[PDB]
Amino acid sequence: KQFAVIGLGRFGLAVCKELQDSGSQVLAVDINEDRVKEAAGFVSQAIVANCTHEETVAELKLDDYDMVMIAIGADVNASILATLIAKEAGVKSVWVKANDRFQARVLQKIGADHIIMPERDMGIRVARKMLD
Amino acid sequence: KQFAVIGLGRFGLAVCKELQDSGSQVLAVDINEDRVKEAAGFVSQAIVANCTHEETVAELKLDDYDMVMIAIGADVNASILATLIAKEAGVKSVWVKANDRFQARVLQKIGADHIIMPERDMGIRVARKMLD
Amino acid sequence: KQFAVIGLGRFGLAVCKELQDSGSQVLAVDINEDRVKEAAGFVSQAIVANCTHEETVAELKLDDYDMVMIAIGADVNASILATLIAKEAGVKSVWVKANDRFQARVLQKIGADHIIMPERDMGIRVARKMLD
Amino acid sequence: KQFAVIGLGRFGLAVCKELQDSGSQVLAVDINEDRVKEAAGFVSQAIVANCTHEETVAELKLDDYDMVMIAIGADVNASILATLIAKEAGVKSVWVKANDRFQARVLQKIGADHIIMPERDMGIRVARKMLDK
Amino acid sequence: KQFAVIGLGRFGLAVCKELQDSGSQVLAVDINEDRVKEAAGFVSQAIVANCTHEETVAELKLDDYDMVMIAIGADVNASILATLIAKEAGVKSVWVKANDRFQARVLQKIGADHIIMPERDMGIRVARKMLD
Amino acid sequence: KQFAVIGLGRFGLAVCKELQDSGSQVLAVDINEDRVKEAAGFVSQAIVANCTHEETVAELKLDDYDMVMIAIGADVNASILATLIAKEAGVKSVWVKANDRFQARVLQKIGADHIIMPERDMGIRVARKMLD
Amino acid sequence: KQFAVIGLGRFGLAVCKELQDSGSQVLAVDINEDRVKEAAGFVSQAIVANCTHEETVAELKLDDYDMVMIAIGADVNASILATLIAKEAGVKSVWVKANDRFQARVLQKIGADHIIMPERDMGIRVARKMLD
Amino acid sequence: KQFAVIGLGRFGLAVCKELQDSGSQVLAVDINEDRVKEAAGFVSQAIVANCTHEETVAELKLDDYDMVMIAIGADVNASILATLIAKEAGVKSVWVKANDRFQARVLQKIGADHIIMPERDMGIRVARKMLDK
């Protein structure tokens, strides 16, 4: 029912668009004000914040959210540190988007419940679409 | 049951791996010899070729393959050129991976039959997966 | 007659100077404010704008003008994007300068109405001039 | 009608293709062998040579040719040097392609009879086509 | 006194040369072979290995060593992965070199016992030397 | 005591913060205005200047300061140039940060009094620290 | 007695300084204002002008000057064009500095009386000083 | 007399040709094999080597040659490193080419014996020659 999306790039904005269209509460958070404004029309609440900051994550009651999506791709350290801070905050399920295999390995060892690699996973999906 | 995959990045090798795992015969083509070498381990046949060159595509006989997947991600110019050359060669079905919506619309004008945007499509898929 | 010329390099400023000398009112658009300044001296109206942006092109009201000339030479990606946005804007006639045969074919697929290859067309003209 | 084209670029090939179709003899010269092979099937004679080499220009006997077209654009210094050597060789009329206004100013002082600026010249022609279309 | 040093850059080789001069057993591990050859003259044992490989770290048997120094600076992700792999292997104390504050905070969160930032720490020590 | 620190990277700002915390007046000089602003909060006086410029250094009056620390790390040419200009300006004690053994020897020839290698010296220090 | 120097780079300024020491009138002219100010204290008259401008060269009566030195190095086209304009200006003796062998070929044919190639010419003398 | 010239640009190849034309044996060293091949035509021995590397310079035995000319122009870092390594090797006389006054002063501190500025010294000579003195 209630979801949080951290990082509002192309991937995260798509997650927010689908989640809200399905009829759920989505807290969209991105350090960049332009993307938060872009996603403000779609999501229930759009907040400009740095999720690498521990006190900001404490203030945003992410432990109350059923699922938290971390969609930071460019800076691997940002995604790893956001995952660590979210896990320390008490978030039970953390979904993290990873662009590289080393990042996926690190995130798996940290404790992310779901690691999403968009290029490989769509590779498999479109291969299955081509087969049938 | 014969497919051609152009570009052997994370998406292209994932489509090849899945297509060859499902029994189909894949021709992997890329300009980077390292990725052609790593794909040649499992693909039916792997070729180091430039797919933006008209005569090279004629040598590859891409018109024989029922589906041609173009997975050139970083070089949008190369992706557009490869789609144009494949369409003018006589390929019935051309699937193209596009990074952004503008490239997707240009590819729609070119004649690409299926256009895959990995980030947005994974956003939609992951949102549906988290919903239920 | 109202004309819009996008890109003010050697070809774009030559088309504007000819169009305005012939008594026509031309709009000169370029991202380089330096080149917009020379045009503003003799051009009915000169604007510093990015013509690959959909909202910017909507602001320019290019659909009012009879013909839109896109003279972006070095950046082929910008030329393709500008032609696509102009066609999507709703301009009746688009003339695009293309420095490559492949770019010309892509622009034909996009929807450009007249495509000028200055080097090849000038070569044909010079050959005809020497013959006669 | 006997012509010579030096520099088989995009501009150079366009001149070579149009000249042969009418039925005039064309000599195509380019330093790069690959471009010479491209015009080999579109000209009377295609020769790989360096046209800034003074002795080579003498061997080609460019003074026999009615018109010579120098179509070197990327290196401004070669086009200026080739123009001077062609003029010293005794060629009556030399047509030179200039990409920049600074290059065209030098070529006028050098003695080129016709300076072609494809971007500026096609800009005027295209605008006149827009006027009456 | 038995030590292990991972990464044989300028910093790592300096820790290996001081440790060997003081008379203690040092294991020098580096992915690059010629740096291993450079350090082989000093250390008791120099091994060319990849320390982001779990099985390789298991074969190296690092839990015997009193202290393990991870001195990988250029790629932050490799340093984080090696640190967490060594922690999972059962190393009692892990000392990690960090070049950035983001890397240092990530390493602090993942469980590094000592984080060394050579620029900041040497800055403090040099200022103290200047004072007296 | 008055100290001048040139270059405000990780090493230079650490020396300034340590020097100023002990009651000494520090002059912080850098070409990057962002780091000069960051240092200006706690540094007695901060100046945006190019210290390879010999006329600029005369304006800074570096001859007055007891010790001049040059902490230019990435630009080695700027490091030797600043050391040379400081020596020619009549500075009694010049401390220079060097990133390589070859740069250190050139700085010794120039006239630097103390040369600090952050990676090598901190490596020796941590090697001693683990032993004891 | 009376000389003119066009271009006040490192080479041109060196000519002006030595010419003044022998008690000769020198007209130092350069497009860049800063370089003219440097030679203002070393020449009889220092003028900021563009010597590529034909009318400007007409005003600066260079035909009265015994020798004119063109010392433009970076832009090959300016030195060639300035040399020609000086020839129509009536300058009997024109000395031109050339940095490349191809430029020295053009300058010889256009009529430069003396072509100076500082690297090649200094190469010959330094060898002679080494021999004796 | 045996000379060593490091760097085979315009200045370096001009010094080698004059030193070999005067009957002396020159060792031309450069990292660019293309320029080493050009010098190998007339110099006694030409070697492709990196002269900022201590072991490489020890292999060249530069201490044998009485004069070593370092003619690295664009890379000031390489010029300074080569001067330092040649001086440490034990070369009695090191001549270095410098582009600016700051590089020249650094090379003076390094230990270069003669420092040549091509532009400034050529300007001085051109002034003297125009003065006809």
Ligand SMILES: Nc1ncnc2c1ncn2[C@@H]1O[C@H](COP(=O)(O)OP(=O)(O)O)[C@@H](O)[C@H]1O
């Ligand atoms: N510390 C952070 N806190 C919150 N959002 C962040 C943080 N760091 C980056 N982001 C956001 O995550 C988004 C994902 O970035 P990225 O994957 O590079 O998408 P894009 O390639 O479109 O920029 C960025 O737009 C950025 O604004």
Ligand SMILES: Nc1ncnc2c1ncn2[C@@H]1O[C@H](COP(=O)(O)OP(=O)(O)O)[C@@H](O)[C@H]1O
């Ligand atoms: N003209 C071309 N012809 C064939 N393959 C190409 C061409 N241009 C790029 N490629 C390949 O397409 C692959 C996908 O590109 P890229 O997205 O950069 O890789 P990744 O998916 O790893 O990010 C690259 O590995 C590249 O080698």
Ligand SMILES: Nc1ncnc2c1ncn2[C@@H]1O[C@H](COP(=O)(O)OP(=O)(O)O)[C@@H](O)[C@H]1O
């Ligand atoms: N997105 C854009 N919108 C408008 N003008 C553009 C855009 N991108 C490039 N231009 C301009 O279009 C012109 C293309 O000409 P170009 O070939 O770059 O220069 P020239 O013809 O002078 O050699 C330039 O003035 C360039 O700045």
Ligand SMILES: Nc1ncnc2c1ncn2[C@@H]1O[C@H](COP(=O)(O)OP(=O)(O)O)[C@@H](O)[C@H]1O
């Ligand atoms: N010295 C020379 N003699 C003869 N031909 C030359 C010489 N230098 C250049 N050329 C030719 O002139 C042609 C000009 O091509 P150009 O259009 O400038 O190349 P590009 O299309 O890469 O810009 C080149 O194809 C080149 O082969």
Ligand SMILES: Nc1ncnc2c1ncn2[C@@H]1O[C@H](COP(=O)(O)OP(=O)(O)O)[C@@H](O)[C@H]1O
């Ligand atoms: N996966 C790995 N396993 C072991 N050693 C590694 C690994 N990755 C990098 N290294 C080593 O760590 C060292 C880090 O040194 P670095 O700080 O990069 O020195 P420099 O900055 O001079 O390159 C490198 O010498 C490299 O060989």
Ligand SMILES: Nc1ncnc2c1ncn2[C@@H]1O[C@H](COP(=O)(O)OP(=O)(O)O)[C@@H](O)[C@H]1O
């Ligand atoms: N010529 C110069 N004059 C003054 N400061 C300089 C000069 N060149 C570089 N610096 C400064 O020295 C600082 C240290 O450089 P660098 O090592 O690149 O940064 P960091 O130490 O943060 O990695 C830089 O912040 C830079 O602004």
Ligand SMILES: Nc1ncnc2c1ncn2[C@@H]1O[C@H](COP(=O)(O)OP(=O)(O)O)[C@@H](O)[C@H]1O
């Ligand atoms: N058209 C011109 N008229 C006068 N002086 C010029 C002109 N073009 C260049 N110069 C000057 O000629 C000098 C030659 O400098 P040059 O060696 O080309 O460049 P740099 O100063 O970067 O070394 C410069 O001081 C430059 O300002």
Ligand SMILES: Nc1ncnc2c1ncn2[C@@H]1O[C@H](COP(=O)(O)OP(=O)(O)O)[C@@H](O)[C@H]1O
């Ligand atoms: N580390 C090095 N060891 C030996 N030779 C070098 C080194 N670095 C540069 N050189 C050579 O010094 C020569 C000086 O060339 P440069 O001055 O850049 O070109 P030019 O002399 O044509 O202006 C270059 O040809 C280069 O190959």
Ligand SMILES: [Mg+2]
């Ligand atoms: Mg994104």
Ligand SMILES: [Mg+2]
């Ligand atoms: Mg990919």
Ligand SMILES: [Mg+2]
């Ligand atoms: Mg143009």
Ligand SMILES: [Mg+2]
């Ligand atoms: Mg061409």
Ligand SMILES: [Mg+2]
């Ligand atoms: Mg290192």
Ligand SMILES: [Mg+2]
């Ligand atoms: Mg630093």
Ligand SMILES: [Mg+2]
């Ligand atoms: Mg200069």
Ligand SMILES: [Mg+2]
């Ligand atoms: Mg040189």
